Structure formats: C-alpha cells, structure tokens
PDB file of C-alpha atoms and ligand atoms in Angstrom:
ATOM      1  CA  UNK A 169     -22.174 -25.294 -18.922  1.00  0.00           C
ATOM      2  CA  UNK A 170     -25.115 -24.491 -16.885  1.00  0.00           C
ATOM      3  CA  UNK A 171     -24.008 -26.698 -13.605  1.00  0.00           C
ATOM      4  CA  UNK A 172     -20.591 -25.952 -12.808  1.00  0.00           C
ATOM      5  CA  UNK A 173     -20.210 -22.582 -10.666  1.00  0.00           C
ATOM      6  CA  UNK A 174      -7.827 -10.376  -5.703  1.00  0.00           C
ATOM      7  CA  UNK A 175      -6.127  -8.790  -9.013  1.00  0.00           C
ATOM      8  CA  UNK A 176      -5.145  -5.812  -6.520  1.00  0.00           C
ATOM      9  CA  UNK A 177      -2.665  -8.285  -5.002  1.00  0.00           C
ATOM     10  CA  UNK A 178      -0.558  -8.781  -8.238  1.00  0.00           C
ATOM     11  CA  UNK A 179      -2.835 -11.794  -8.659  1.00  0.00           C
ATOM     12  CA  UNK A 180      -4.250 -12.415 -12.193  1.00  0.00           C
ATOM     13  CA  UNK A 181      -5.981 -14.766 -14.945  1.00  0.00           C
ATOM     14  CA  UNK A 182      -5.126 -14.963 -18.489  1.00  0.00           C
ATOM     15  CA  UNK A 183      -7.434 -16.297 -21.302  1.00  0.00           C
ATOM     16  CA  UNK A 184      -7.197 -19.277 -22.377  1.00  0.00           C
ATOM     17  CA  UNK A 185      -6.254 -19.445 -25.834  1.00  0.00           C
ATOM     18  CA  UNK A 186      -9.190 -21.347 -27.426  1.00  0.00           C
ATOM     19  CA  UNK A 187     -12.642 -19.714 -26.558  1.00  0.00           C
ATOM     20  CA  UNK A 188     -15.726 -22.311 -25.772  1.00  0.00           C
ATOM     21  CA  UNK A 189     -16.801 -21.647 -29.050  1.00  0.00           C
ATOM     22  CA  UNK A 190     -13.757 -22.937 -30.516  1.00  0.00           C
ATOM     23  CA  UNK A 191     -13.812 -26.217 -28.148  1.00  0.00           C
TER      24      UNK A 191
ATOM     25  CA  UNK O 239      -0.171 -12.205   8.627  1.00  0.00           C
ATOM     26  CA  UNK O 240       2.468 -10.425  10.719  1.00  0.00           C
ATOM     27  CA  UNK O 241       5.164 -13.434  10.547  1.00  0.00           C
ATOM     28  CA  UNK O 242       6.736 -11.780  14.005  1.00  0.00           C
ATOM     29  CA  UNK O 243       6.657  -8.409  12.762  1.00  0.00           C
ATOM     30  CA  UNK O 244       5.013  -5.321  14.470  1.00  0.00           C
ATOM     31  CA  UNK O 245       2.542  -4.990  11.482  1.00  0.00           C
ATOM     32  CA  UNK O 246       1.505  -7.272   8.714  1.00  0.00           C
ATOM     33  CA  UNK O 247       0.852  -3.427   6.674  1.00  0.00           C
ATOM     34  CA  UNK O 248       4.194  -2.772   5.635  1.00  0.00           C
ATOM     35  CA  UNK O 249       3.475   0.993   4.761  1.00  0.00           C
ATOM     36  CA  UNK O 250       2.716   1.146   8.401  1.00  0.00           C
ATOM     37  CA  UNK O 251       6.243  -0.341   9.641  1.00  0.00           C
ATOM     38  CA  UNK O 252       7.507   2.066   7.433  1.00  0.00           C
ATOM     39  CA  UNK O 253       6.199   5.188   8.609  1.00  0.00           C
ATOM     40  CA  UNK O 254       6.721   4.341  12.425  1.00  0.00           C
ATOM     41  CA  UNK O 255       9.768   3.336  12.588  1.00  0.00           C
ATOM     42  CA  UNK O 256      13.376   5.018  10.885  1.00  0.00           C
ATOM     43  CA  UNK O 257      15.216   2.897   8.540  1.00  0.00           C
ATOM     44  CA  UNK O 258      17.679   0.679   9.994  1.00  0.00           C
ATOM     45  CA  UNK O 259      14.565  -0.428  12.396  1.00  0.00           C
ATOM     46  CA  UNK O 260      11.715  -0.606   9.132  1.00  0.00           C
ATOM     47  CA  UNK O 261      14.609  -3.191   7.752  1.00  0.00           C
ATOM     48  CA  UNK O 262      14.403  -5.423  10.723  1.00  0.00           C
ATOM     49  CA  UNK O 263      10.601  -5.646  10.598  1.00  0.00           C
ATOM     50  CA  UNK O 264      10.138  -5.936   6.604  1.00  0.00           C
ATOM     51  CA  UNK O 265      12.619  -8.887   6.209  1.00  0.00           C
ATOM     52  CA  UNK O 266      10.599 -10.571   9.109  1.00  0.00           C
ATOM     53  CA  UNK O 267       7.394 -10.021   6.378  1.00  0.00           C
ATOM     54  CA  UNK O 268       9.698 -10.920   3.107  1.00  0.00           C
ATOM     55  CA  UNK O 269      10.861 -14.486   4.248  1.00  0.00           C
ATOM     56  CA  UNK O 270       6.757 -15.220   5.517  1.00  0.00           C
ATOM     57  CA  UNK O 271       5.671 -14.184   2.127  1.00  0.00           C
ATOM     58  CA  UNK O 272       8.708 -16.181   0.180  1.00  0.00           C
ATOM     59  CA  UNK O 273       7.648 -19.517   1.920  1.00  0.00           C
ATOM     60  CA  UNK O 274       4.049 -18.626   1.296  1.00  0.00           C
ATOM     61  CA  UNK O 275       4.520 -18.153  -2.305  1.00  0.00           C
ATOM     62  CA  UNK O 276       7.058 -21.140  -2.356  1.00  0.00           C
ATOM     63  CA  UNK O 277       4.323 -23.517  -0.794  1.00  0.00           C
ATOM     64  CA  UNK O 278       1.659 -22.478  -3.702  1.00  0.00           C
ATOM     65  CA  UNK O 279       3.850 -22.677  -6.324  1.00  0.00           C
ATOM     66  CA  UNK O 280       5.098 -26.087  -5.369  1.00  0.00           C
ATOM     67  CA  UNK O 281       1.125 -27.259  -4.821  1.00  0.00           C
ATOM     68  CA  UNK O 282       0.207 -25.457  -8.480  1.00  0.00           C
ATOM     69  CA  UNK O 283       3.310 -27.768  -9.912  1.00  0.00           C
ATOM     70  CA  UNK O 284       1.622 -31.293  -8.293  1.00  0.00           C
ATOM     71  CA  UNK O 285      -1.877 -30.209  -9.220  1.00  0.00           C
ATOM     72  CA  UNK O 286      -0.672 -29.711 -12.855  1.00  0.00           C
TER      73      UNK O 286
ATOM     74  CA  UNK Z 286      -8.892  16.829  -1.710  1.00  0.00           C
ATOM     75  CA  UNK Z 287      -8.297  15.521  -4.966  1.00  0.00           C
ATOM     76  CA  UNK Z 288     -10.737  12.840  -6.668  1.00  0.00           C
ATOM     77  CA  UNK Z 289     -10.476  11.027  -9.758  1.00  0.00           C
ATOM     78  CA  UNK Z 290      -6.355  10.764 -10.301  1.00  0.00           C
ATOM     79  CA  UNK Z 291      -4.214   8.665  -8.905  1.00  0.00           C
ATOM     80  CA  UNK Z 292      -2.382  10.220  -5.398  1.00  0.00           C
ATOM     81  CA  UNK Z 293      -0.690   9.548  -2.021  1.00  0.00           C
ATOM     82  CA  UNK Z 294      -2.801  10.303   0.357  1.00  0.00           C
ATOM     83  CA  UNK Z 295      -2.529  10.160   4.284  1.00  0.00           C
ATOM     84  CA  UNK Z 296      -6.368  10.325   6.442  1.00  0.00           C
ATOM     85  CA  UNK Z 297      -5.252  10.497   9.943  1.00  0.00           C
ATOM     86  CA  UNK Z 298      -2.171   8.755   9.445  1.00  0.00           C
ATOM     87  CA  UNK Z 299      -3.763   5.751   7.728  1.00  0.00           C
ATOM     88  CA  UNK Z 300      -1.219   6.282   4.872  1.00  0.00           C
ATOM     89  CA  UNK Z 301      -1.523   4.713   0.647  1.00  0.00           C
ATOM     90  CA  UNK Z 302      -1.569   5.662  -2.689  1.00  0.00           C
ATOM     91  CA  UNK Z 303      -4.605   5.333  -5.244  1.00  0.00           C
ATOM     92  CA  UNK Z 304      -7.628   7.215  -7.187  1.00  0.00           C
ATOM     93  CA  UNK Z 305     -10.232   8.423  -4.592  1.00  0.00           C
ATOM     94  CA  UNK Z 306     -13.767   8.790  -6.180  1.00  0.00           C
ATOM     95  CA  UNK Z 307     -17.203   9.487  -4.076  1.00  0.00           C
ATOM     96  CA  UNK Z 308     -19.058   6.274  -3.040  1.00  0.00           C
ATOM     97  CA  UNK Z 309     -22.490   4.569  -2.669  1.00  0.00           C
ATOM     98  CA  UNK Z 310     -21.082   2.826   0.423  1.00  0.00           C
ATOM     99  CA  UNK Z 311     -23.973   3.425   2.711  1.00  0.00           C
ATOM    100  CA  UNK Z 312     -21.607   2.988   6.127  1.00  0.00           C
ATOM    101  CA  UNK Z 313     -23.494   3.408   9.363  1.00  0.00           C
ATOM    102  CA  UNK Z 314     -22.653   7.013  11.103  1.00  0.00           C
ATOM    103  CA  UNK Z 315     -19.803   5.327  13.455  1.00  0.00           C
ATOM    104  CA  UNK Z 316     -18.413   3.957  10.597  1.00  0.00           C
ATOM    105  CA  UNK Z 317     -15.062   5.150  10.061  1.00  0.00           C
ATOM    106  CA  UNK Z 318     -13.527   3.203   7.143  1.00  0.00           C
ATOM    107  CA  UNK Z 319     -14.813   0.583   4.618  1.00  0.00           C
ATOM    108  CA  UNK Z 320     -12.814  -3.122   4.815  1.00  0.00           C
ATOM    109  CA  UNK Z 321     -12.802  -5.620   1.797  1.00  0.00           C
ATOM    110  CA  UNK Z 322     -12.879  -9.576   1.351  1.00  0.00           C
ATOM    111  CA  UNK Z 323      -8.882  -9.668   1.457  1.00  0.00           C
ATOM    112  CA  UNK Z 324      -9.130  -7.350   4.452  1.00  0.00           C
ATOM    113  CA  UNK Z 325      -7.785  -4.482   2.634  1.00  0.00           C
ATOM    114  CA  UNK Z 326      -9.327  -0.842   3.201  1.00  0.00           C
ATOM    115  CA  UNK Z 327     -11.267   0.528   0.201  1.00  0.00           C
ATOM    116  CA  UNK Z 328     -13.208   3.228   1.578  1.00  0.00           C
ATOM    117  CA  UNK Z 329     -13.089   5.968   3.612  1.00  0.00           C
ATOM    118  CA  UNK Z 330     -14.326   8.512   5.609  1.00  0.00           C
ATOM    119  CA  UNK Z 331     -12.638  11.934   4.852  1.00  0.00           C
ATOM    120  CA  UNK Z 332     -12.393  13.291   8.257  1.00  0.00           C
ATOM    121  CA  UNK Z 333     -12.817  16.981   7.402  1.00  0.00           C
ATOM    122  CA  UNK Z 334     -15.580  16.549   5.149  1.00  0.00           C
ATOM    123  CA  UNK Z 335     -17.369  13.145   6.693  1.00  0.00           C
ATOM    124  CA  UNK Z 336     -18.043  12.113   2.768  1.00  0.00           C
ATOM    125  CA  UNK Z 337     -17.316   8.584   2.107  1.00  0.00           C
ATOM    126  CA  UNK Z 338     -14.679   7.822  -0.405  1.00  0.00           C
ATOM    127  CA  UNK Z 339     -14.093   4.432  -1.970  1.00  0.00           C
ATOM    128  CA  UNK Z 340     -10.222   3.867  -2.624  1.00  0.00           C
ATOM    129  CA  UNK Z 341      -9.280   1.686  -6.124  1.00  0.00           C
ATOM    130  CA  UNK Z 342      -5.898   1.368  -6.832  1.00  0.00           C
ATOM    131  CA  UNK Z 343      -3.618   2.925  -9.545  1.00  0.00           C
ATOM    132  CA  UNK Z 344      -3.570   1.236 -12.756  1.00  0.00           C
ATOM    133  CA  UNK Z 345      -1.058  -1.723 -13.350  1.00  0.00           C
ATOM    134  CA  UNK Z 346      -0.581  -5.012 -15.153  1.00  0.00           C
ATOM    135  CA  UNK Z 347       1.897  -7.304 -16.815  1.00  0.00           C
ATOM    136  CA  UNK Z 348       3.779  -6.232 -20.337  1.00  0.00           C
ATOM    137  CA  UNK Z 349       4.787  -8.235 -23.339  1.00  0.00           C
ATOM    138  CA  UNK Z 350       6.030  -7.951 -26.393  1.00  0.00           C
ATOM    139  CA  UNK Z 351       5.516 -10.131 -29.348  1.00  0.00           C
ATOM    140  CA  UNK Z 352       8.581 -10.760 -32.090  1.00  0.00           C
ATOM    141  CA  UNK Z 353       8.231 -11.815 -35.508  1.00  0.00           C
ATOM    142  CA  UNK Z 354      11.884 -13.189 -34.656  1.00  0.00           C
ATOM    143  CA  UNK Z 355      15.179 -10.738 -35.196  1.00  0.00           C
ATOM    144  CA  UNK Z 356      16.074 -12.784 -38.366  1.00  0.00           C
ATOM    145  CA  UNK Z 357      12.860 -11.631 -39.727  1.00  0.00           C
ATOM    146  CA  UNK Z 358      12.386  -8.088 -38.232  1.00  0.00           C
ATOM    147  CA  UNK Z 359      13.309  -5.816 -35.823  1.00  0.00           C
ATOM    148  CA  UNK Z 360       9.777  -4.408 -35.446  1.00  0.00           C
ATOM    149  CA  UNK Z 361       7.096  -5.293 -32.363  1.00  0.00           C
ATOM    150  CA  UNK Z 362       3.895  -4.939 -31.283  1.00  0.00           C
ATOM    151  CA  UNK Z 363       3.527  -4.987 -27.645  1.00  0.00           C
ATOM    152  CA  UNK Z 364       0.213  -6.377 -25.268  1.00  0.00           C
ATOM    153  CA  UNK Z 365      -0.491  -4.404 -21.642  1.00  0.00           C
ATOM    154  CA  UNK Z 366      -2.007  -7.272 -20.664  1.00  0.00           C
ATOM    155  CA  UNK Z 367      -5.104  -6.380 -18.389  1.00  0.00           C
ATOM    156  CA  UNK Z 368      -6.030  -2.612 -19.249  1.00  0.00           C
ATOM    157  CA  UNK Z 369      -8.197  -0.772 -21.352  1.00  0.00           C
ATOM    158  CA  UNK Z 370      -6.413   0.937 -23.694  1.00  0.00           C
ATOM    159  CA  UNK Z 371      -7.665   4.364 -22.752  1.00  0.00           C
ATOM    160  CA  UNK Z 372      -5.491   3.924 -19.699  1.00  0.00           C
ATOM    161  CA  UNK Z 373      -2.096   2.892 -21.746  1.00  0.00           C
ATOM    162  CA  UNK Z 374      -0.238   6.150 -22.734  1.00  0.00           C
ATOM    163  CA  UNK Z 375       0.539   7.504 -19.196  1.00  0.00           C
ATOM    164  CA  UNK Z 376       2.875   4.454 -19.107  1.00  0.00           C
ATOM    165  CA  UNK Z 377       5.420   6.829 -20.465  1.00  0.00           C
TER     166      UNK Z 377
ATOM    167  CA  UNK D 224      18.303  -2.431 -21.841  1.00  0.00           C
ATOM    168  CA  UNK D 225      15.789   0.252 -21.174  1.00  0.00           C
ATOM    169  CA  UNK D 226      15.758   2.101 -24.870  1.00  0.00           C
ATOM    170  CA  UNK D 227      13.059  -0.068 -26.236  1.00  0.00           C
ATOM    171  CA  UNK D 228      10.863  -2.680 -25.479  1.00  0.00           C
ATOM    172  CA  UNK D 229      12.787  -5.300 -27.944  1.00  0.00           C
ATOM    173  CA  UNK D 230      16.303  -4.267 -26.676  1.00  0.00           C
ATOM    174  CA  UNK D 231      14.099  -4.937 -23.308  1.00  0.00           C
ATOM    175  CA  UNK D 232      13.483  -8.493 -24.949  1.00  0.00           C
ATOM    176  CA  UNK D 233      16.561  -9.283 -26.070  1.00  0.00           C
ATOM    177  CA  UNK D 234      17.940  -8.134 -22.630  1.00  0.00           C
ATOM    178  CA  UNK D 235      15.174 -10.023 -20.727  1.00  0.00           C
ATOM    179  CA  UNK D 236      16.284 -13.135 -22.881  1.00  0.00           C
ATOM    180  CA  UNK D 237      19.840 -12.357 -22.610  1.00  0.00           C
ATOM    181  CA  UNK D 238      20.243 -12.834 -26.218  1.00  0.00           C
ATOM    182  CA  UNK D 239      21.363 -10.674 -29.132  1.00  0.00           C
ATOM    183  CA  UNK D 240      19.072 -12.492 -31.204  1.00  0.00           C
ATOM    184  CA  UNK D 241      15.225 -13.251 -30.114  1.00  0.00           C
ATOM    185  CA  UNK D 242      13.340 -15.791 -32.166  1.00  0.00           C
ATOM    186  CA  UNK D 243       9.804 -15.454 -32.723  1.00  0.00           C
ATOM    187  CA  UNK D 244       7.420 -16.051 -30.228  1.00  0.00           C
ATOM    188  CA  UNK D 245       5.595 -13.459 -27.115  1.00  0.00           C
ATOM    189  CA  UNK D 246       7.729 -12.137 -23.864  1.00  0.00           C
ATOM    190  CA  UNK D 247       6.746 -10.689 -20.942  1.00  0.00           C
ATOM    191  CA  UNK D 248       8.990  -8.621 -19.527  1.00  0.00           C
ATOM    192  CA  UNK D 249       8.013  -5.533 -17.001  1.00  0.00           C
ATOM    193  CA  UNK D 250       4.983  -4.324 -15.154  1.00  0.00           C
ATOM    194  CA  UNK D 251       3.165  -1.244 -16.149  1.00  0.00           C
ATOM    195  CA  UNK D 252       2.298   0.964 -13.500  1.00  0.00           C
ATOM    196  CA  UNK D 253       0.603   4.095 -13.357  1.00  0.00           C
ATOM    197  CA  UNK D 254       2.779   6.537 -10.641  1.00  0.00           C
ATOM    198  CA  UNK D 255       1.286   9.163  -8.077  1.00  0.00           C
ATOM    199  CA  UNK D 256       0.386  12.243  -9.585  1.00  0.00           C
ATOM    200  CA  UNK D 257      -0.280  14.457  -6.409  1.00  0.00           C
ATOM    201  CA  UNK D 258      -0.172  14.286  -1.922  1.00  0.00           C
ATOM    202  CA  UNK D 259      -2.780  14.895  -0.030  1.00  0.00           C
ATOM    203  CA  UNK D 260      -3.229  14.759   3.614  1.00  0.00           C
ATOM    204  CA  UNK D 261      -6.421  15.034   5.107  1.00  0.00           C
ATOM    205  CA  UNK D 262      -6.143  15.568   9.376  1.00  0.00           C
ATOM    206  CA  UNK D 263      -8.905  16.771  11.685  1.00  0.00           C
ATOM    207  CA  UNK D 264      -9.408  20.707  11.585  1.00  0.00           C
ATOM    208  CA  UNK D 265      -8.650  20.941  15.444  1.00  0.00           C
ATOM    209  CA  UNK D 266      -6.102  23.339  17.116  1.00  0.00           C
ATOM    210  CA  UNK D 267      -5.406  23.261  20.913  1.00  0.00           C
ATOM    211  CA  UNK D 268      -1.857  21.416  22.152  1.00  0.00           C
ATOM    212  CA  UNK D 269      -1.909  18.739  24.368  1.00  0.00           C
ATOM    213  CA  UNK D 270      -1.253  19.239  27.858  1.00  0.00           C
ATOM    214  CA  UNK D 271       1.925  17.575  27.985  1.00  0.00           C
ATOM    215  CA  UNK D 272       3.772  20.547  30.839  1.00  0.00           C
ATOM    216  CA  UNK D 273       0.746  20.044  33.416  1.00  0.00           C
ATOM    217  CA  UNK D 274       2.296  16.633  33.071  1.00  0.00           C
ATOM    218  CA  UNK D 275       6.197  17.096  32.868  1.00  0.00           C
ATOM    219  CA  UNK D 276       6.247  20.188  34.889  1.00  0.00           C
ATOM    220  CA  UNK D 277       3.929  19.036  37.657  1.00  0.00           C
ATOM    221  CA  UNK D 278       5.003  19.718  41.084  1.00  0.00           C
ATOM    222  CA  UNK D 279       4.156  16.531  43.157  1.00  0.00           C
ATOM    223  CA  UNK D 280       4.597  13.273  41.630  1.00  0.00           C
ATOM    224  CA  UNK D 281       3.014  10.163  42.577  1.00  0.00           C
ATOM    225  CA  UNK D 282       4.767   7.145  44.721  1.00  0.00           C
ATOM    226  CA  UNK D 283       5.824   4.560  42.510  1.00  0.00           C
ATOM    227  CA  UNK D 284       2.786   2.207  44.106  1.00  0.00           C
ATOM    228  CA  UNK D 285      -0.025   4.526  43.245  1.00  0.00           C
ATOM    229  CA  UNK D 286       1.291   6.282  40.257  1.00  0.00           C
ATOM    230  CA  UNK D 287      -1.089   8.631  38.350  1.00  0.00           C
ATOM    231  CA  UNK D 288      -2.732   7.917  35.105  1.00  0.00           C
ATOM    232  CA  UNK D 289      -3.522  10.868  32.945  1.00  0.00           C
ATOM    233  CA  UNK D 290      -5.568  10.602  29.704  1.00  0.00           C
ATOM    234  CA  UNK D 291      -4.770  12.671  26.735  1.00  0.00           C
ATOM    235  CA  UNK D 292      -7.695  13.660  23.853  1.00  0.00           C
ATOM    236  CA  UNK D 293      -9.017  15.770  21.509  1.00  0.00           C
ATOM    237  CA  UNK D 294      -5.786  17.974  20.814  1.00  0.00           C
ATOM    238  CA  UNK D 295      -2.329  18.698  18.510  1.00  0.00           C
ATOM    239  CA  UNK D 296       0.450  16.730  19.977  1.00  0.00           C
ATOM    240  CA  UNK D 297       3.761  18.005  19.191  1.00  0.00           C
ATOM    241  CA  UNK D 298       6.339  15.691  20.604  1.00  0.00           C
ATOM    242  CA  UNK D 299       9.284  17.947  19.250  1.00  0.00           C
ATOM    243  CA  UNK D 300       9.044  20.201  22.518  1.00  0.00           C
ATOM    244  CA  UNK D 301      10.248  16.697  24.195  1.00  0.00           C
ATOM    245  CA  UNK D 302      12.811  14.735  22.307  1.00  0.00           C
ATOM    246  CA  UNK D 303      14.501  17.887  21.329  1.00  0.00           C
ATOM    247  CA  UNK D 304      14.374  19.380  24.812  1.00  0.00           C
ATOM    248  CA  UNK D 305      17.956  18.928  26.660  1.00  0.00           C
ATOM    249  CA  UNK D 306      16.185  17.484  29.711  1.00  0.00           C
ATOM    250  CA  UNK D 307      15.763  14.132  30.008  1.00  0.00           C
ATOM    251  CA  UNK D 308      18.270  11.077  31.090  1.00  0.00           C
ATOM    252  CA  UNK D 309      16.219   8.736  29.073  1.00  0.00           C
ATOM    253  CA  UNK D 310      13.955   8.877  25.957  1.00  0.00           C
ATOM    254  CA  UNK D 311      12.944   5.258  24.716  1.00  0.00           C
ATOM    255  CA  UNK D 312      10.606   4.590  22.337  1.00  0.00           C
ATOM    256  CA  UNK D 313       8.156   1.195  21.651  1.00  0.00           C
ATOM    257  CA  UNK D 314       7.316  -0.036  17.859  1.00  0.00           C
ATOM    258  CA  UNK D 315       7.932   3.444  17.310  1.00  0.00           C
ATOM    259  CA  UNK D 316      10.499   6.352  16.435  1.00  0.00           C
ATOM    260  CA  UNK D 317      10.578   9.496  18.148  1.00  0.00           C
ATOM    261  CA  UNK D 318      11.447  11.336  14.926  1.00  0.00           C
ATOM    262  CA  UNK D 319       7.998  10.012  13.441  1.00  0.00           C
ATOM    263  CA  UNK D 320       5.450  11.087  16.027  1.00  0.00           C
TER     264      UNK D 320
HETATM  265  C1  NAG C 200     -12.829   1.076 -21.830  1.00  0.00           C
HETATM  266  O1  NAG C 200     -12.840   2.381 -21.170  1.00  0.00           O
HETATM  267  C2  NAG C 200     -13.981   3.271 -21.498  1.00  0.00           C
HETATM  268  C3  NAG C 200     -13.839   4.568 -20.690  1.00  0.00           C
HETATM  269  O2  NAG C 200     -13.810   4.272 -19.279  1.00  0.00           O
HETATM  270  C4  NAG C 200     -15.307   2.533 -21.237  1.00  0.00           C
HETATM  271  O3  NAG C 200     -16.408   3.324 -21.735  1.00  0.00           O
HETATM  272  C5  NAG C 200     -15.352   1.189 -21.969  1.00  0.00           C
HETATM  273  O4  NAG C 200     -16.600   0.517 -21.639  1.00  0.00           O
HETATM  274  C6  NAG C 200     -14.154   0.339 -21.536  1.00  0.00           C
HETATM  275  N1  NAG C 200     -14.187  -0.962 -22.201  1.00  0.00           N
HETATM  276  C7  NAG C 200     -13.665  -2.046 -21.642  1.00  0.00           C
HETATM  277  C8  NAG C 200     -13.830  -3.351 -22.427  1.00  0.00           C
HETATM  278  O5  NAG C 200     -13.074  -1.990 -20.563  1.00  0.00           O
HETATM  279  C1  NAG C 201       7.091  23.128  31.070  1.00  0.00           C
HETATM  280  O1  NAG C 201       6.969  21.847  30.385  1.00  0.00           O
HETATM  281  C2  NAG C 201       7.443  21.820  28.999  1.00  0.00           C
HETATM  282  C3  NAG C 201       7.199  20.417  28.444  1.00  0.00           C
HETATM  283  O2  NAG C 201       8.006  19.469  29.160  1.00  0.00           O
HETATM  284  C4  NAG C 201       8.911  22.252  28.992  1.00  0.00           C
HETATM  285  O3  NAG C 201       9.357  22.396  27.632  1.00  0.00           O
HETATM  286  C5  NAG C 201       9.104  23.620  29.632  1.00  0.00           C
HETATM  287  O4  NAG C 201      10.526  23.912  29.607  1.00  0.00           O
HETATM  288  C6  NAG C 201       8.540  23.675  31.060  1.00  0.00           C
HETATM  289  N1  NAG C 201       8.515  25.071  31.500  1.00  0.00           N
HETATM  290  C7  NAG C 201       9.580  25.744  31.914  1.00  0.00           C
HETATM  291  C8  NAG C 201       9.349  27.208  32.307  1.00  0.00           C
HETATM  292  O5  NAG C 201      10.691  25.219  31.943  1.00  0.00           O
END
C-alpha cells in the first residue's frame, strides 16, 4: 500500500463499496 | 478547446453576442464536447 | 461586494456565478486574476478594492434515492451524494 | 413527476412500481442568491466626437490610427444615432457593448 501513488467539471469518484479493511 | 467557435468560455459567447448568433457559436462547442465525451466513454468501456 | 454566499458576479466584464471569500493567494502586484490546473479562473482581483478573492463554486452533486421496493413500502431515504450535510437543506 | 423524490423514481424508471434497490435521479444545485458587479470607479467618456465629428479625414493610404484609454465608453450615442449607412459588428453585438 505504501508503493503505488476536477469535481468542478461535473467530474466525480464514488467509494467503492468494500473499504481496504474489508479486502 | 474552441471547436471553431469564437470562445471555448461559453458564458463569454453568451454575453457578446444576441441570441440567434450565441446559438450558432454554442452548438459549434456542444457537438466538440459530445464527441469528446463519446471518445472517453467508449475507451472507459474497452478498459473495463 | 458580497463574500461568503453564493452570487453572480461580473469584475470588468469577466462574468460567473459562485461564493467569493478573501484569499492567501500571494499574486505579484501586476497580477490581475488567479488561473487553475484545468485553466479555469479561481481568483481575483476586485478592481475597486485591489483585494484578492479566490472564487469556489456553488454547491452541487448527484441525488439518489434508495427504495425498500413499492411492494414493501412507499417510504425513502435519499443520499446527496458528495456534500456535507450542513449544506443540504437549501436544496429546497 | 416532480412531487416527491419516489414519484421522481418511479418517473425516472418509468414504472408505477420500483423494486428495491438505489436510483439516481437529479443533480442538486445550490442557485445564486445575489448580483454583483464590480467596474473601475472612473468617470470621463471616451472621445468618440473628436473622432466622428472631425473635420479632415485621412486618405484611404495613410489613414489615422487613434487610441482610446482610460474612460466610460457609451456606444449607445452611436448605434442609436440616425447617422450612419453602415454599422457592422465583429464576434460582437452592438446591443452588448
Ligand atoms: C462538515 O461541515 C462543517 C462546517 O463547515 C465542518 O466543520 C466539518 O469538518 C465538515 N465535515 C466534513 C466531513 O466535511
Ligand atoms: C458629435 O459627435 C457625436 C458622436 O458621433 C454625435 O452624436 C454628435 O451629433 C456630433 N455633434 C453634433 C453637434 O452633431
């Protein structure tokens, strides 16, 4: 979890619906 | 982008000019932005 | 000048709508408006006053509702999907 | 449609009945309260008669060049005068100026 690295615009993100403490 | 049109703002187009001229100019920006959205869409449906 | 509510406004006929607050955008005294990564304005200079303003725009998002099916109920609960809920009732 | 958000649903849908499940189906928006303009606090009109009611004109080959600053235009006092054969305007209106 460590090595891997607009909304104005109508742009978003939702959640995903498991958190990483679920996975 | 401006796709053609006088201004890629399209607040701008539509305080210099009076209607039947704004119309002109903002379909000029709709149909750019429709093929732009079209194009990710499709690209977001391969990548999935 | 109105701060902190959500306006049109019009500086020199550079024309939008959005909340104007005071900023800690240091520009440079020739500075004349602030510019974003998207290349959208998002500060300004008030031209009366030479403060700087930063520009955010007026609250928005998506809406949904959520059904326990019509056979079951005819009650909701509804999700404003990317807002703090201090925001919501001016939806109205 | 617009009484409630499930007759939104069920309109959304197009269905009298809506099984169970989540819908999205508008965009909030908060709406503009207020106007405000903010101009410079400057008062003296542009010259625009030592231009349009200037004796000699230039020839067409050395035509003058006159450069306009620091003042209120009002444009009115041209495209509503009577005088002129011809009036047209470039990615812009002459209402809006
Ligand atoms: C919600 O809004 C209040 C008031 O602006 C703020 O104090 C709080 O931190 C916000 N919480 C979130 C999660 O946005
Ligand atoms: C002087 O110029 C202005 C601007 O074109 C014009 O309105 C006005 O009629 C001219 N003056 C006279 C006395 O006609």
């Amino acid at each position: 979890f460590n090595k891997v690295t607009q909304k104005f615009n109508g742009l978003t993100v939702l959640p995903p619906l498991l958190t990483d403490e679920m996975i | 982008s401006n796709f053609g049109a006088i201004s890629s703002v399209l607040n701008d187009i539509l305080s210099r000019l009076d209607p039947p001229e704004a119309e002109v100019q903002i379909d000029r920006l709709i149909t750019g932005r429709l093929q732009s959205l079209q194009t990710y869409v499709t690209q977001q449906l391969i990548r999935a | 000048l109105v701060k902190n509510k959500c306006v049109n406004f019009n500086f020199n006929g550079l024309t939008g709508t959005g909340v104007l607050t005071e900023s800690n955008k240091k520009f440079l005294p020739f500075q004349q408006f602030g510019r974003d990564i998207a290349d959208t304005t998002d500060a300004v200079r008030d031209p009366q006053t030479l403060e700087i303003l930063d520009i955010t725009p007026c609250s928005f998002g998506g809406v949904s509702v959520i059904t326990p099916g019509t056979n079951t109920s005819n009650q909701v609960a509804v999700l404003y999907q990317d807002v703090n809920c201090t925001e919501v009732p001016v939806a109205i | 449609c617009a009484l409630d958000p499930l007759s939104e649903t069920k309109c959304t849908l197009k269905s009298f009945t809506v099984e169970k499940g989540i819908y999205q189906t508008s965009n909030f928006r908060v709406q503009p309260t207020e106007s405000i303009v903010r101009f410079p606090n400057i008062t003296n009109l542009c010259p625009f008669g030592e231009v349009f009611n200037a004796t000699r004109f230039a020839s067409v080959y050395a035509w003058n060049r006159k450069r306009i600053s620091n003042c209120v235009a009002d444009y009115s006092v041209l495209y509503n005068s009577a005088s002129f054969s011809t009036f047209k305007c470039y990615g812009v209106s002459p209402t809006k100026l």
